[PDB]
Design a protein around this ligand. Structure first.
Ligand SMILES: O[C@@H]1[C@@H](O)[C@H](O[C@@H]2CO[C@@H](O)[C@H](O)[C@H]2O)OC[C@H]1O
Ligand SMILES: [Ca+2]
Ligand code: NA
Length: 131
């Protein structure tokens, strides 16, 4: 998985750098893309050295789930700053992907990003939006 990445270009969820999970798998999507799934509550997934440049204040992810769930976006580590929380309600199937967005606190410069999962969701990709 890449050692660094730009916040303002698509980041593939399957190209993560570390996770605490023992269940998480790289999955296929309907259009022969990939994602992450078999995620459980408490699972964290880290993406190294994301460059936010002069500032991001939003987060968008393309996700699929059949249960209402939430994903914290943290900077630096699992106990680092809570940037925001993406609340995801059921998209209707594990294979029906929806872009969902939330606000975050303005973050600048280079930081690891940790996604923290409250439950099962399939994640294809994500991207940040500038301030
Ligand atoms: O059709 C398959 C999906 O069902 C699968 O998504 C998984 C469904 O079971 C859930 O408990 C898991 O959390 C979730 O990832 O992904 C692969 C796809 O081919
Ligand atoms: Ca993907
Ligand atoms: Na393990």
């Amino acid at each position: 998985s890449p050692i660094r990445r730009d916040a303002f270009s698509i980041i593939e969820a399957e190209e993560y750098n570390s996770t605490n999970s023992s269940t998480l798998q790289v999955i296929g999507t309907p259009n022969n893309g990939r994602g992450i799934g078999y995620i459980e509550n408490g699972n964290t997934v880290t993406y190294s050295n994301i460059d936010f440049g002069s500032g991001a204040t939003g987060f968008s992810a393309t996700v699929a789930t059949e249960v209402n769930t939430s994903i914290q976006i943290r900077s630096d580590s699992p106990t680092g700053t809570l940037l925001g929380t993406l609340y995801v309600s059921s998209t209707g199937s594990w294979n029906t992907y929806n872009t969902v967005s939330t606000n975050i606190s303005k973050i600048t410069g280079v930081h690891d990003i940790v996604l923290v999962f409250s439950g099962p969701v399939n994640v294809d990709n994500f991207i940040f939006s500038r301030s």
